[PDB]
UniProtKB/Swiss-Prot annotation, chain A:
Domain remark in the UniProt entry: This protein differs from the typical myosin heavy chain structure in having head and tail domains but no discernible neck domain.
Lineage: Eukaryota, Sar, Alveolata, Apicomplexa, Aconoidasida
Protein family per UniProt: Belongs to the TRAFAC class myosin-kinesin ATPase superfamily. Myosin family.
Protein name per Swiss-Prot or TrEMBL: Myosin-A
Coiled coil: none
Top-level lineage group: Eukaryota
Gene: MyoA
Transmembrane regions listed in the UniProt entry: none
Subunit record text: Component of the glideosome complex composed of GAP50, GAP45, MTIP and MyoA; the complex is formed during the late schizont stage and in merozoites. MyoA, MTIP and GAP45 probably form an initial complex in the cytoplasm which is then recruited to the outer face of the inner membrane complex via the interaction with GAP50. Interacts with ACT1.
């Protein structure tokens, strides 16, 4: 559930850890 | 959604180009290295973005196709509320906290799943404590 917002969280985590 | 002109007011195209030169082979850049550059530029691509560009142009992007990809990565509609609501879904005691292990499950299960070690490292880098204030966490990753 709430998959699109999950994608954004994971996206920003990968951005942060780049 | 940002066009390339608007993208180039948001980020320095001098950086966009230098990062492309760093990763290009044969005048082209792979999606994965484009996503890497997007992140160095402060953008946050998901698999939706990657698959959209791949569907148009394949695995390797020309400079201009890379610019189009970056414009797709901008995500101006991103807000902290939607991130918080995603985590809050699992906070049924309404404590405001989830443990590192709970956070890990949430992040390594559905969607563009992090690896276990990726989730672990991001969580340990955020906090030395086991209870994660997920609102604080969301505010942190969005910056």
């Amino acid at each position: 559930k709430n998959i699109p917002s999950l994608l954004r969280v994971q996206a920003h985590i990968r951005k942060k850890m780049v | 959604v940002a066009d390339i002109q608007q993208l180039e007011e948001k980020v320095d195209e001098s950086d966009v180009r230098i990062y492309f030169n760093e990763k290009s082979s044969g005048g082209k850049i792979s999606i994965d290295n484009a996503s890497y550059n997007a992140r160095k530029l402060g953008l946050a691509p998901s698999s939706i973005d990657e698959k959209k560009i791949k569907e148009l142009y394949g695995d390797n992007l020309t400079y201009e196709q890379y610019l189009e990809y970056l414009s797709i990565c901008v995500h101006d509609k991103d807000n902290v509320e939607e991130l918080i609501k995603m985590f809050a879904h699992f906070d049924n005691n309404c404590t405001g906290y989830l443990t590192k292990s709970q956070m890990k499950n949430i992040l390594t299960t559905w969607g563009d799943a992090l690896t276990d070690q990726e989730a672990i490292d991001a969580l340990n880098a955020f906090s030395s404590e086991d209870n994660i204030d997920y609102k604080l966490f969301c505010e942190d990753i969005l910056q």
